Write a protein that binds this ligand. Structure first.
Ligand SMILES: CC(C)CC(=O)N[C@@H](CCSC[C@H]1O[C@@H](n2cnc3c(N)ncnc32)[C@H](O)[C@@H]1O)C(=O)O
Ligand SMILES: Nc1ncnc2[nH]cnc12
Ligand SMILES: [Cl-]
Length: 213
């Protein structure tokens, strides 16, 4: 029934309502609830430097209601990891590759927490990337993500030493995108497909090669 929709430059004309709704939800959740004060904005929309033409949004929709989601951004452009937290990836280095995208802003609305949605969101990043031929995703993440990644069968490679970021233990890591990981998650969520891709076909790797130039 309810699906996670892939929204990008090529199809956002079908999702302008939904995108605006999600920017406001990001403000409610990341700013008001989690207190990431650096992201507070007076328009009540949580929008940063990595919300632009090249961003891909994976949003869980029930009708036109956003109930969860996350976003992906190219590592071939300046990214949050490369610009804000490069020291967190000092051991292995900060990724820069059309085949590696930075994963961020993972959220679930209160009404849908501790239910089926969470594992669907985990399957969604694997499904989208595999479809696009994206090999890995990178993230700056709170260290409590490690057991969550492991529970979902994600293959994780730490990029540097954990460090305190605004009173919270944080780290940089890559996740290997795997057909094997996805197949198990499809079995667990009881659905052969969780990502809906309406409108024109997105070629993410081509777009990342372009903005790399
Ligand atoms: C996808 C999931 C596994 C990991 C995840 O959701 N990762 C999150 C970041 C987890 S770390 C939380 C800290 O990052 C700061 N932060 C977030 N965006 C920023 C920005 N644009 N500039 C400066 N600081 C920023 C914010 O103020 C917190 O202190 C994300 O990338 O959206
Ligand atoms: N902010 C948080 N800290 C620790 N565990 C969590 N599980 C979900 N959110 C969390
Ligand atoms: Cl804007």
């Amino acid at each position: 029934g309810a699906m996670i929709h892939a929204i990008s430059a090529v199809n956002r004309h079908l999702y302008e309502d939904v995108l605006e709704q999600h920017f406001r939800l990001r403000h409610d959740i990341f700013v008001e609830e989690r207190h990431w004060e650096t992201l507070r904005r007076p328009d009540g929309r949580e929008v940063d430097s990595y919300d632009d033409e090249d961003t891909v949004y994976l949003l869980a929709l029930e009708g036109r209601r956003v109930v969860g989601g996350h976003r992906l951004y190219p590592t071939t452009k300046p990214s949050m990891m490369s610009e804000v937290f490069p020291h967190l990836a000092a051991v292995r280095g900060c990724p820069s590759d059309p085949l590696i995208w930075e994963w961020s802003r993972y959220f679930v609305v209160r009404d849908r927490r501790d239910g089926a949605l969470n594992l669907q969101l985990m399957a969604a990043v694997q499904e989208f990337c595999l479809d696009q031929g994206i090999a890995q995703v990178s993230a700056i993440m709170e260290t409590w993500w490690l057991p969550r990644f492991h529970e979902a069968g994600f293959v994780v490679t730490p990029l540097g030493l954990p460090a305190l970021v605004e009173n919270a233990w944080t780290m940089a890591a890559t996740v290997d995108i795997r057909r094997q990981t996805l197949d198990v998650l499809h079995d667990r969520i009881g659905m052969p497909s969780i990502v809906q891709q309406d409108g024109p076909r997105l070629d993410a790797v081509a777009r990342a090669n372009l903005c790399g130039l």
